[PDB]
Amino acid sequence: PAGHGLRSRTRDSFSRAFRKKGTIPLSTYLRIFKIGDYVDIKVNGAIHKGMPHKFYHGRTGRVWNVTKRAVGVEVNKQVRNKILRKRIHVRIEHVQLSRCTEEVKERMKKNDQLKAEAKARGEVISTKRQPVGPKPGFMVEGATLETVTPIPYDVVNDLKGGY
């Protein structure tokens, strides 16, 4: 409405991948969705029912409801000077389980194990990971050195493959 249809400017967004049209693989319908799961919204152009608005395409949200064929997703949306947690319902064909938190549980388990080991030996440690820092000094074995010099200019080589 108001000068723009629901699917305006979706020629590329809602189109299917090259040589990937037709029947949908069964893995899409065999997935399990539960409350609190993070999902990625990817519109399947062949499924016209339960289609999210184009804005939510390419955005990640959290599952808050589970119906027979669709799943409720809460997606942040910036409107002027605030963020709105807009709740939508989307069919499972248009949604994929997100990997944005795949390493969290593993890291927590390893941190707990390390903390328990440190407590056993009576030491205090920090399990926080750190950004890559400066490397220490080291010795590099001498080898044959190849000299690099600027190339004399030749106009005939200005074209790819030569003039």
Partner: peptide
């Protein structure tokens, strides 16, 4: 950005309106 971008505080328990 003068006063935003405001993120509403998320409570432990969210409303159940709209659920099955």
């Amino acid at each position: 950005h003068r006063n935003g971008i405001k993120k509403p505080r998320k409570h432990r328990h969210s409303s159940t309106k709209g659920m099955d």
